[PDB]
């Protein structure tokens, strides 16, 4: 299945994922596509920051769902 | 199976792959060999731009097939 | 299950892991969260240095256990 | 099983591996332990450079075998 990740300027990243993929896997795929390492990534769905160890289905993220990407800064 | 990845100068990278390998896997292997991360890579077969989440067999890419590698620039 | 990795100022990194995870996998997860590559990491449990090729269950590390993270320097 | 990776000054890296592990997997473990990425690594066993896609058993690499590590430079 396909989902989308959007930056805050509305730039979009298209991903191929499975419901059993962890949020961490999704971050790895974002790194694969954009060079942004997982530790610098926060993903948000329905206003909620998503935890690395949980799956997409845990958050009811289904096909064509849109996630939001923001940076994690040091400190 | 074995495939070749050619740069635009005709330089060749030899890879060992399975038809069920994703294009992303191939890019990982190119990184394993040349240090070029996946997000900087564009793979082309028969003039067709190749997507990370799909497999080699999805494109009918066969033994001794040649992919072409070009860089992805920012913006 | 969830474990905690503690830095020496008592800063905490929380991880979701399986007992069958290798120490190396844990290091990969720490890299996923903090950007610290595995080779720079030493993990300690009950005063004992943990080996990359071994599992968490090999060390009898269970849920809510605390590991300590230390740096590996050159030479 | 256990194998050894030796530099040309004879410093040793100890690895635990499977016969079904690829040469690339070993290079990944060498990166995990020393921070040297696979593309900069050449491994030598029995006077021959080892190809990433082969398994250890393809080269008849056995328990207590020692591989030799040399750098790959740009050309």
Swiss-Prot record, chains A, B, C, D:
User: Where would I find the Ubiquitin-like domain in this sequence?
Assistant: 1-75
* UniProt crosslink position (Glycyl lysine isopeptide (Lys-Gly) (interchain with G-Cter in ubiquitin)): 6, 11, 27, 29, 33, 48, 63
Q: At the top level of its lineage, which domain of life is listed? A: Eukaryota
Q: Which residues carry this modification: Phosphoserine?
A: 65
**Where does it reside?**
Cytoplasm; Nucleus
Q: Where is this site: Essential for function?
A: 68
* Site (described: Interacts with activating enzyme): 54, 72
PTM details? Phosphorylated at Ser-65 by PINK1 during mitophagy. Phosphorylated ubiquitin specifically binds and activates parkin (PRKN), triggering mitophagy. Phosphorylation does not affect E1-mediated E2 charging of ubiquitin but affects discharging of E2 enzymes to form polyubiquitin chains. It also affects deubiquitination by deubiquitinase enzymes such as USP30. Mono-ADP-ribosylated at the C-terminus by PARP9, a component of the PPAR9-DTX3L complex. ADP-ribosylation requires processing by E1 and E2 enzymes and prevents ubiquitin conjugation to substrates such as histones.
What exactly does this protein do?
Answer: Exists either covalently attached to another protein, or free (unanchored). When covalently bound, it is conjugated to target proteins via an isopeptide bond either as a monomer (monoubiquitin), a polymer linked via different Lys residues of the ubiquitin (polyubiquitin chains) or a linear polymer linked via the initiator Met of the ubiquitin (linear polyubiquitin chains).
Protein name, please?
Answer: Ubiquitin
Q: Which organism is it from?
A: Bos taurus (Bovine)
Q: What lineage is this protein's organism placed in?
A: Eukaryota, Metazoa, Chordata, Craniata, Vertebrata
Name of encoding gene: RPS27A
What fragment of the full-length protein is this? 1 to 75 of 156
């Amino acid at each position: 299945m396909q989902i989308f990740v959007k930056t805050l300027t509305g730039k979009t990243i298209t991903l191929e994922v499975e419901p059993s993929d962890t949020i961490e896997n999704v971050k790895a795929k974002i790194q694969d596509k954009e060079g942004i390492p997982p530790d610098q990534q926060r993903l948000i769905f329905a206003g909620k920051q998503l935890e690395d160890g949980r799956t997409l289905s845990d958050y009811n993220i289904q096909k064509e769902s849109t996630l939001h990407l923001v940076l994690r800064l040091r400190g």
